[PDB]
Design a protein around this ligand. Structure first.
Ligand SMILES: CC(C)[C@H](NC(=O)OCc1ccccc1)P(=O)(O)O[C@H](C(=O)O)c1cccc(NC(=N)N)c1
Ligand SMILES: [Zn+2]
Length: 304
């Protein structure tokens, strides 16, 4: 069964998307935006009070299979939204005024693989011509300085950029959806672990985004907000210099589509447990992360 303080396998997460939608008909709608290489449905949840011409924030989790706390966060977020709507003033305002598109798990095939075969799997599970090596790094697969730096052209490597940009059904589906909704999507938030950072563009080059001063101030405010709960310290900055240069990432691509608020979140911890973050830390991790996501949401709402 589904728990919010445990990591849930895909069958359970899928059942949950159907259940939470059924239980909250005027706050949540479910669609699928594509299928994975292995035929799983890429569900997207539209969270918000329906209305005409509403702006939106897009958030995805589970780009990378082994980053389990990411998947956990998208599920936590959805419950918080439906539990507190009508009671907590900010979330009530958020859901009245905008829609959150929440994509609980992008890389479903890899996630399943981390449950069944290899806890440390990262990439998708697509096949590659001329080799037995499996998978492409979805966050090297977007059309953003594609495969020029911090990526591999070898399918056997963890950062394989794929045979071409959007070669993966999963990344094509995500790009297609975002391209189809550019008029409404005002921010892009992509949830990863670990490192306790908020990154903004660019990672594929050392050039800075036009609005980098604003993004820096926004990230700064968001991390200090996060720290209020448990003292957790996040660093922040443009990807290339803050963590490492790397091309083909979705945050850079979304920004260059015109989504001016584009962030990669790296959640707990800083390496003690790394990707294998204890379930005992899910609640506290999600709780503090909510504060940063809500700060960003309120700021974006104030700049429409
Ligand atoms: C621990 C955490 C930072 C993860 N990093 C990771 O597994 O690094 C492994 C690795 C191994 C060899 C070469 C490069 C990278 P990840 O979540 O995969 O980091 C993102 C990524 O590399 O896709 C990441 C972190 C910060 C910013 C961005 N943005 C971007 N467009 N590159 C992307
Ligand atoms: Zn990641």
């Amino acid at each position: 069964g589904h728990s919010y303080e445990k990591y849930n396998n895909w069958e359970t997460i899928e059942a949950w998307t159907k259940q939470v939608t059924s239980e909250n008909p005027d706050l949540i709608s479910r669609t699928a935006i594509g299928t994975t290489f292995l035929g799983n449905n890429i569900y997207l949840l539209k969270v918000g009070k329906p209305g005409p011409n509403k702006p939106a924030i897009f958030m995805d989790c589970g780009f990378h299979a082994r980053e389990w706390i990411s998947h956990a966060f998208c599920q936590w977020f959805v419950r918080e939204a439906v539990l507190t709507y009508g009671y907590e003033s900010h979330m009530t305002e958020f859901l009245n005024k905008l829609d959150f598109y929440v994509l609980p798990v992008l890389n479903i095939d890899g996630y399943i693989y981390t449950w069944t075969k290899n806890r440390m799997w990262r990439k998708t599970r697509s096949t590659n011509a001329g080799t037995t090596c499996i998978g492409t790094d979805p966050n090297r697969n977007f059309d953003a300085g594609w495969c020029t730096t911090g990526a591999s052209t070898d399918p056997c490597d963890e950062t394989y950029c794929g045979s071409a940009a959007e070669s993966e059904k999963e990344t094509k589906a995500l790009a297609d959806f975002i391209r189809n909704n550019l008029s409404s999507i005002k921010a892009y938030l992509t949830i990863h672990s670990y490192s306790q950072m908020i990154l903004y563009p660019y990672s594929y080059d050392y050039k800075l985004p036009e609005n980098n001063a604003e993004l820096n101030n926004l990230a700064k405010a968001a991390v200090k907000e996060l720290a209020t709960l448990y003292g957790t310290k996040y660093t922040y900055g443009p990807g290339a210099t803050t963590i490492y240069p790397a091309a083909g990432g979705s945050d850079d691509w979304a920004y260059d589509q015109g989504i001016k608020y584009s962030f990669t979140f790296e959640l707990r911890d800083k390496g003690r447990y790394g990707f294998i973050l204890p379930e005992s830390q899910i609640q506290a991790t999600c709780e503090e992360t909510m504060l940063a996501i809500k700060y960003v949401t309120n700021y974006v709402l104030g700049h429409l």
